[PDB]
Structure 1
Amino acid sequence: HYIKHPLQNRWALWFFKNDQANLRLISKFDTVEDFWALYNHIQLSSNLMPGCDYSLFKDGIEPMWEDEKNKRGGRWLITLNKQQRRSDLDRFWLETLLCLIGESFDDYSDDVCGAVVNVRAKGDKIAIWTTECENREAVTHIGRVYKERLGLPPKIVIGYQSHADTATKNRFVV
């Protein structure tokens, strides 16, 4: 009887550990209900073992540079210190999940490939991946919208790195 609320896209939640076989599908979902059903039955990012990643990517996109919708793409990086693990990490990740599945980037939502959270000893990272790092308009808008939704002061500056640059410096800042 109950009618689920469909999302604009099919999404896939992945888990990664350091040394294809290293990367595991957690679940896919295409409704608001099936998302919350997933979120409430998986471990928080703050409780993950160091050197492990969660990633949400649109259906058919592998969360890797060499994927053809990521190859010419880049990422908006958020860098967290050791103290922010308890206060901001889990909150900033859910805000990123909701941003993506909510199609919150107006004309430029199709540029978004997915988002990644890195759980590291030195300092945690959250990134939204887009598809074309030379698209100033699309990348700049997605950056401004993202920075607002996280609630960061204007003085705090975030950078956008090409995946080609990272595989060895930002292309944009906002």
Structure 2
Amino acid sequence: KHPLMNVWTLWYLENDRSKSWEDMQNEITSFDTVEDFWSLYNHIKPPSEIKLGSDYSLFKKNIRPMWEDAANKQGGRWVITLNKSSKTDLDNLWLDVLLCLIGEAFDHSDQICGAVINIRGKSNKISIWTADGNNEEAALEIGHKLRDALRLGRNNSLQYQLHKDTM
């Protein structure tokens, strides 16, 4: 098998009013090779088929998709907003991001924590979480690497955001 540079973990958040936002998140599985990634991806529904209010998340190094996590707390995220994009375009964009992560395409791969996709009414978002928000060199190299790799349209916007509530 073809070993990955990092171990990754897939999470699935399902919206449940009775459960806290943190409790909505479910740990599915972990993998460390290319073959084990595809085994998983090929047998799970794409984001196009999961329920509204649900998320997929792929994080490395046993990092939880939460602000409270050490690796995320001082970090931020590149947010991509998608309005009424085709379901096939959405799925293809999600996968494209996954392959950037496990493939470690970014020169500043170490700064990346994981990716998240939100399926919501009227809008769907795909975000890539970074470890340090103060690091503009890393944030921008990753940011530039995206628009070229994702082949993003002019309409779709790519904007960086801190996790921590400060201006």
- 1:85 and 1:124 in contact (8 A); partners too: no
Alignment partner, residue 42 of structure 1: 44
Q: Percent of aligned pairs with the same residue?
A: 54
Alignment partner, residue 138 of structure 2: 138
How big is each residue's C-alpha offset from its partner over 1:25-52, in whole Å with a ceiling of 9 and x where there is no partner?
A: 1110000000000000001101111000
Greater RCO (Cα-Cα under 8 Å, separation 6 or more): 2
Q: How many residues align?
A: 162
Secondary structure in 2 aligned to 1:70? helix
Q: Check if 1:77 corresponds to 2:79.
A: yes
Q: Distance in 2 between matches of 1:85 and 1:152?
A: 14
- 2:80 and 2:157 in contact (8 A); partners too: no
- 1:6 and 1:31 in contact (8 A); partners too: yes
Q: What is the RMSD of the two structures over their aligned residues, measured on CA atoms?
A: 1.7
Q: Give the TM-score taking structure 2 as reference length.
A: 0.91
Closer/same/farther in 2, CA of residues 41 and 71 from structure 1, 3 Å limit:
same
Secondary structure in 1 aligned to 2:121? coil
Q: Which runs of 5+ in 1 are unaligned?
A: 170-174
Q: Distance in 2 between matches of 1:113 and 1:41?
A: 24
Deviation, 1:134, is 0.7
Q: Give the TM-score taking structure 1 as reference length.
A: 0.88
Alignment partner, residue 11 of structure 1: 8
Q: Check if 1:91 corresponds to 2:92.
A: yes
Q: Distance in 1 between matches of 2:37 and 2:73?
A: 28
Q: Distance in 1 between matches of 2:152 and 2:25?
A: 32
